[PDB]
Design a protein around this ligand. Structure first.
Ligand SMILES: CC(C)(N)[C@H](N[C@@H]1CCc2cc(C#Cc3ccc(Cn4ccnc4CO)cc3)ccc21)C(=O)NO
Ligand SMILES: [Cl-]
Ligand SMILES: [Zn+2]
Ligand SMILES: [Zn+2]
Length: 300
């Protein structure tokens, strides 16, 4: 049997606060038809504004990944998108009551839980994958983001903070999803910030919802969160989580390998844009027989 498209089985609702806006927001996930993709909609507005979660709709990428359509935005999509990608959700409406996805606990754990509580529905259409055929790379200064051909899905990341909390950590991790669970090993990795960068945002009337309840706060010498880390390598795992989410703006699951080096949302989106434009570097494929596939998905 083919690998089929997936949507949600039921509607589910969550509440939280926008990391940047500090505004309380209601999120509603709904099933969608085949070939819809993930579509955001601002149900607080009249008319209601829909923004497909695609690379073409990305605006600002300086702090988080924002979607735009004229003067309407949806901020901070990446951790929700990471959860959709990690569970292989093809088709969904994401309704928001305000301009930002709720931060929840700073990770993708609450979203992965919410989605699986709703349950998944296989649909009668072949799931489309984007397969990397040729290496594609973007760089700026010492930052690099790369796609390499690979029969599977694997994401590697390296960070380099010249900082007391990070010295003598390897600062590198690789996850290969043939053997390793997005839920168990990536989903819980919380966002993080250094104190001087946080203070800068607050001075600009940003990061207004942020706190030790939804982020790892690192002062000049120490993590401030009294209860410690979820993973020895939570920082680099969060970078992988963000990459997975940013990558999902392609609109289809990837067959290939991503490697990031001190990269973030801006270079992640540049990599997508360069990939898309280089049509020799990728193809859309389906699997009529799941046994020939380099990726598999958990039961719905
Ligand atoms: C790629 C990353 C890891 N750079 C990125 N990081 C996000 C970006 C914005 C942000 C803001 C905060 C905060 C925050 C915050 C703000 C205020 C306080 C407490 N506070 C209140 C007043 N002054 C202070 C400073 O102590 C604590 C944390 C944390 C994390 C992040 C990412 O994951 N993108 O997907
Ligand atoms: Cl970047
Ligand atoms: Zn402050
Ligand atoms: Zn993040």
């Amino acid at each position: 049997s083919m690998i089929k498209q997936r949507t949600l089985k039921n509607i589910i609702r969550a509440t939280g606060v926008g990391l940047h806006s500090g505004e309380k927001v209601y999120l509603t996930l709904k099933p969608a038809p085949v070939d819809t993709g993930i579509v955001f909609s601002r149900t607080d507005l009249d008319p209601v504004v829909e923004i497909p979660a695609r690379a073409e709709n990305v605006g600002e990428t300086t702090m988080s990944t924002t979607l735009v359509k004229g003067d309407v935005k949806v901020d901070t999509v990446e951790h929700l998108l990471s959860a959709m990608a990690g569970l292989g959700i093809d088709n969904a409406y994401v309704e928001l009551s305000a301009s930002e996805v709720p931060i929840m606990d700073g990770s993708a754990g609450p979203f992965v839980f919410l989605i699986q509580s709703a349950g998944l529905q296989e649909q009668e259409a072949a799931k489309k994958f984007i397969r990397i055929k040729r290496e594609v790379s973007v760089e700026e200064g010492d930052k690099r983001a790369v796609f390499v051909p690979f029969d599977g899905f694997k994401v590697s990341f390296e960070i380099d903070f010249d900082h007391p909390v990070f010295r003598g950590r390897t600062q590198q991790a690789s996850v290969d999803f043939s053997s390793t669970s997005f839920v168990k090993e990536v989903s819980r990795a919380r966002t993080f910030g250094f104190m001087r960068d946080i203070e800068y945002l607050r001075s600009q009337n940003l990061a207004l919802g942020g706190s030790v309840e939804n982020a790892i706060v690192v002062d000049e010498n120490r993590v401030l969160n009294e209860d410690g880390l979820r993973y020895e390598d939570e920082f680099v795992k969060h970078k992988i989580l963000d990459a997975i989410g940013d990558l999902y703006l392609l609109g289809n699951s990837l067959i290939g390998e991503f490697r990031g080096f001190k990269s973030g949302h801006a270079l992640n989106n540049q990599l997508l844009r360069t990939l898309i434009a280089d049509k020799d570097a990728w193809e859309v494929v389906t699997f009529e027989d799941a046994r020939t596939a380099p990726i598999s998905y958990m039961r719905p």
